[PDB]
Design a protein around this nucleic acid. Structure first.
Lengths: 132, 47, 123, 65, 21, 136
RNA sequence: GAAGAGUUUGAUCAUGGCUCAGAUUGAACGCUACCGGCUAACUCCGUGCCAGCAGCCGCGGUAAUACGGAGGGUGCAAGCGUUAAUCGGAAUUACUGGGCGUAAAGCGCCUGGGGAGUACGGCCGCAAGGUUAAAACUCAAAUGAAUUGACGGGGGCCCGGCAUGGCUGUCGUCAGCUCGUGUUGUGAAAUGUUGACGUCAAGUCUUCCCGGGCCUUGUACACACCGCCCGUCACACCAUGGGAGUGGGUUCAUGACUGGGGUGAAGUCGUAACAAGGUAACCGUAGGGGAACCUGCGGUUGGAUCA
RNA sequence: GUAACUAUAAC
RNA sequence: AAAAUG
RNA sequence: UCGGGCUCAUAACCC
C-alpha cells in the first residue's frame, strides 16, 4: 500500500493554497475508485492551506495507477490571498512511494543516494502537469 | 543537459528537493494598472 | 589640486581592469569542457541558461555561456570562448563561439547566421 | 564597389528628385516619389536629429557614390 | 464634454481618455 | 518668418490619492536667423498642448545677440547651475558642431560656425539656459 | 580647431558611476550585420518568463515593432559582424579643465556603492585596539537636496471581466477635484485651492476607539506603512584571509577545518532602523546577549512636539 | 518538538 | 499601560 | 490539538 507525499515550495501563501487544492484532488481520486483515504502525517499552513501531508492509499494495485502521477505540479493562477491581485506560477511536488545492522543501513542509504542523483540529473522533467 | 542543484548531494527525495530550489521558484508577474505597475520607460518608449 | 601639491604626488591614473581576466588580452581562447549544465538567472528573469565550465589552456577554469538553440555539447570536448558578459548570470563572463572546433552550429537557423556559426542555405 | 539594386528605392527614402534615373519618363508618373520605400509608406515617421543629418550625408552618396 | 473608454491606439490596457470644455 | 525647433519632451508626474497625474514638458527655441534667440518651456496634460504652449512662451522674453556674420565674436563660457557650456567661433565651412541642447539654440539664432562642448550637467533644460547666458 | 545619448526617482535637479555612438590594429573567429530606446530602419505567423535575447535600460508569464521565422527596410560593402587591445567621449586623476557644509572629500583630502576603514604587513599600545591601507569578487546602483502624495502608536482645528464596451459597487452625498491665463522657482512643482477627478488591473464575457477633511511637520514609503527593511542561524555556490603545513620559482600554488564577506528562490527566528519606528536616532567607547542589538558614559543635531 | 530533500537545531 | 508580521 | 471571535489576513489574546 503506497504512500503519497505532497509538499509546498517557494511560496508563503500561494504554494500552501495550491498544496491544499492538490491534497483534496488526490483524496477525491481515491474515494471515487474505491481506495482508503487514511492520512498518517499532516501539517497545516502558517497563514492558510497545507505545508505537508502524507496520505496512505490502500486497495488493489495502489502504486500502479499512481505511478505516472508522481512529480512537481505547476499552477498558473491569480492569488486570492495577495493584496496586489497578481498572477502566480507556483509549484507543489507529489512524491509517491510504495510500502517496504549499521553496515546494511548505510548500504541501503548509499543505494538510495545514487538513485535520487539519477532522477535529478535528467533536469526539470519533474514538472509533468500544468494547471491554468 | 544537466542542472546544477543548489542542494548538492540529494539523499532522500529528488522531486521534493528540486521543489525547494530556485528552479521551481515563486514566479511573480508584473501586473499593469495595479500594485507594482508603473513603467518609467515603456516596452517601446514614448513616440 | 594645488600646483605645488601635484609635484610631490602626481595624479594617480585609475588602472583599467579588464572585465575578462581569463582571456589574458586575447580575442578567443581554446579550452576543454569540464561540466556542461543549466542554471537559473538572477532576480525577475526566469529561464534555464545553457552554461559550461571551461578549463582553459592558460590554466584558468571559467564558466561560459552557450548561445543559440539546442546545443550539441557534452563533457570533455574542445570549446573556443570569447568575451562579453551575460548579465542574467553571476560568475558567467564568457560566450561559447558556435561552429568552432568540436562545437557545432545551430540546427535550422536563417537570420543572424554568422553569430551562431551557421552556413548559408541554397534557397 | 557599386550599388546594383533599385535606383528608384534610393530616391523614395530621401523624398526628393535627385535625377538618378535616365530621364525619359518623369519621376512622379513612373514611381511614387512622396511614398516611403517598401511596405511602410502610408505613415509619416518623426525623424530624429541624428536622422536628418544622416539622410543629408546619404543624399551625397546616392548621387556620386 | 467627451469621453472615450477602452482601447485607443491598439493598447492592451484600457484607457479612460476624456476631454472637457 | 522665425524658425521654431524642439529640443526635448519629458514626461513629469504629480502624485495624488488616485495614482499619478502625468504632464508633458516641452522645451522649444525660436529665432529669425540673424541674431535673435529665446528659449521656451511648457507644462500641459497633453503632448500637442505642451509644444504649442512652450513656443508661445518663447515668442516673448527674447534676447539680442551680436554676430560676426554667422559666427560668435569671441570664445565665451556660459554657466547655468550645474551645467558649464563653452563656445568658440570658427571660420566659414565648419558647420554647427554642438549638443542638441546647444545645437538647437544655435541653429535658430543664425550661428553657423560654432565649436561647443557641455561640461558637468548635460541635462537639456539647463544647457539651453547656459547657452543663452553665454550669448548674453 | 572640441556633439552627446541611455541608465538611479512617483517626478525633479544635481552628484556620480556603469554603458553606448568614433578612430585604429602584427589581430583572431563566424559568414561569402541590424530594425524597442540609445542608434538610421516595422508588420504578420509560431512559441508562451518556455525556448531564447542582451552593450546598457530591459524583453518573453497567450494577442512579442526587443525571442524564432517570413516579408519589407536600414547601414556598410567584398567585405561584414562578433570578441580582444589602446585612446576617445570621461572636466570620470581636471596643467589647460574638477572639487571637499550636507552628494565621496578639511597644506590636507576625494574619485561609484558594497566588500572595508576591514584583511594582510609595518609602526604604536600593557591590552582594548588605533593609525597606515588594499585586493579578488559583486550590483547598476548607492547618495545629496528639494517637490508631490501617502502614512506616523507627530501636532492643531473640525466631522459623522488581467483584451473590453456598457452597467454597478466602493472610499462616500465624503467635499473636494483641477484646467487656462499669469507669476515665482534651474526644475519637479508651488501660487490659485493658504452622487466629481478618480481609486480598487473591484464585480459581471468629544478625552479614548473607528473612519474622513484641512493645515503643518518628519519620512530610508511610492507596490505608498497591508510600505520598506536589518541581523544571526539553515542550505548551497563563488571569491577571500587565518591555518599543523607542504611543494615550487621573498613570492606563487595547495592544505583538513575555521573567521568574516558576497550571491542566492515574499525559508526559521525576531523586528533593529525609516514617523516622538512605538525606549529619538547616531558617533566613540566599555560591558553583556541567538540575533538584529541592549545598557552605562560622554558627545551630536543629520530628533519630533512645545498643547 | 521545530527551518529551503535530508541531517542538524539559532528558536 | 497595549499594536509582532505581511 | 480542534471549534468560534478579534484583525484586511496571520501570530498573540479571549471563549
Amino acid at each position: 500500500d503506497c504512500y503519497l507525499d505532497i509538499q509546498a515550495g517557494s511560496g508563503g501563501t500561494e504554494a500552501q493554497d495550491w498544496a491544499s487544492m492538490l491534497e483534496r484532488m488526490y483524496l477525491r481520486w481515491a474515494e471515487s475508485r474505491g481506495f482508503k483515504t487514511e492520512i498518517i502525517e499532516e501539517s497545516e499552513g502558517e497563514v492558510a492551506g497545507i505545508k505537508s501531508v502524507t496520505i496512505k492509499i490502500s486497495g488493489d494495485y495502489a502504486y500502479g495507477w499512481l505511478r505516472t502521477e508522481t512529480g512537481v505540479h505547476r499552477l498558473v493562477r491569480k492569488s486570492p490571498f495577495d493584496s496586489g491581485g497578481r498572477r502566480h506560477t507556483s509549484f507543489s511536488s507529489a512524491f509517491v512511494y510504495p510500502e517496504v545492522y549499521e553496515l546494511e543501513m548505510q548500504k541501503k542509504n548509499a543505494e538510495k543516494q545514487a538513485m535520487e542523483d539519477n532522477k535529478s540529473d535528467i533536469g526539470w522533467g519533474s514538472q509533468i502537469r500544468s494547471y491554468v | 543537459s544537466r542542472y546544477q542543484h543548489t542542494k548538492g548531494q540529494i539523499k532522500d527525495n529528488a522531486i521534493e528537493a528540486l521543489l525547494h530550489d530556485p528552479l521551481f521558484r515563486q514566479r511573480v508577474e508584473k501586473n499593469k494598472k495595479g500594485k507594482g505597475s508603473y513603467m518609467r520607460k515603456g516596452k517601446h518608449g514614448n513616440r | 589640486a594645488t600646483v605645488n601639491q601635484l609635484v610631490r604626488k602626481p595624479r594617480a591614473r585609475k588602472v583599467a581592469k579588464s572585465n575578462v581576466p581569463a582571456l589574458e588580452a586575447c580575442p578567443q581562447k581554446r579550452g576543454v569542457c569540464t561540466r556542461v549544465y543549466t542554471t537559473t538567472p538572477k532576480k525577475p528573469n526566469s529561464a534555464l541558461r545553457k552554461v559550461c565550465r571551461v578549463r582553459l589552456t592558460n590554466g584558468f577554469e571559467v564558466t561560459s555561456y552557450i548561445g543559440g538553440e539546442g546545443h550539441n555539447l557534452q563533457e570533455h570536448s574542445v570549446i573556443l570562448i570569447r568575451g562579453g558578459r551575460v548579465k542574467d548570470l553571476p560568475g558567467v563572463r564568457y560566450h561559447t563561439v558556435r561552429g568552432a572546433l568540436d562545437c557545432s552550429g545551430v540546427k535550422d537557423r536563417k537570420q543572424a547566421r554568422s553569430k551562431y556559426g551557421v552556413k548559408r542555405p541554397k534557397a | 564597389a557599386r550599388y546594383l539594386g533599385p535606383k528608384l528605392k534610393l530616391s523614395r527614402r530621401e523624398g526628393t528628385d535627385l535625377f538618378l534615373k535616365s530621364g525619359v519618363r518623369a519621376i512622379d508618373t513612373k514611381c511614387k516619389i512622396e511614398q516611403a520605400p517598401g511596405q511602410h509608406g502610408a505613415r509619416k515617421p518623426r525623424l530624429s536629429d541624428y536622422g536628418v543629418q544622416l539622410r543629408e550625408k546619404q543624399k551625397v552618396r546616392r548621387i556620386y557614390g | 464634454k467627451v469621453e472615450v473608454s477602452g482601447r485607443l491606439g491598439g493598447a492592451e490596457i484600457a484607457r479612460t481618455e476624456w476631454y472637457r470644455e | 518668418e522665425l524658425q521654431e525647433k524642439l529640443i526635448a519632451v519629458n514626461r513629469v508626474s504629480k502624485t495624488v490619492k488616485g495614482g499619478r497625474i502625468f504632464s508633458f514638458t516641452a522645451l522649444t527655441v525660436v529665432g529669425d536667423g540673424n541674431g535673435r534667440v529665446g528659449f521656451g518651456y511648457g507644462k500641459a496634460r497633453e503632448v500637442p498642448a505642451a509644444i504649442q504652449k512652450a513656443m508661445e512662451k518663447a515668442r516673448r522674453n527674447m534676447i539680442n545677440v551680436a554676430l560676426n556674420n554667422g559666427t560668435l565674436q569671441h570664445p565665451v563660457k556660459g554657466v547655468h547651475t550645474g551645467s558649464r557650456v563653452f563656445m568658440q567661433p570658427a571660420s566659414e565651412g565648419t558647420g554647427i558642431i554642438a549638443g542638441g541642447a546647444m545645437r538647437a539654440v544655435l541653429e535658430v539664432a543664425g550661428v553657423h560656425n560654432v565649436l561647443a562642448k557641455a561640461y558637468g550637467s548635460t541635462n537639456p533644460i539647463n544647457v539651453v539656459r547656459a547657452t543663452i547666458d553665454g550669448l548674453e
